[PDB]
Amino acid sequence: RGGRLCYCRPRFCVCVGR
């Protein structure tokens, strides 16, 4: 696909993929 970024870490965390 174009890009799927999804993850979550107590240091930083965000989900986005489109």
Side-chain angles (χ1 to χ4, degrees):
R1 220 71 69 181
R4 305 81 28 102
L5 300 316
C6 249
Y7 29 70
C8 197
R9 278 80 236 232
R11 287 106 218 228
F12 54 87
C13 153
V14 144
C15 243
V16 255
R18 69 276 316 264

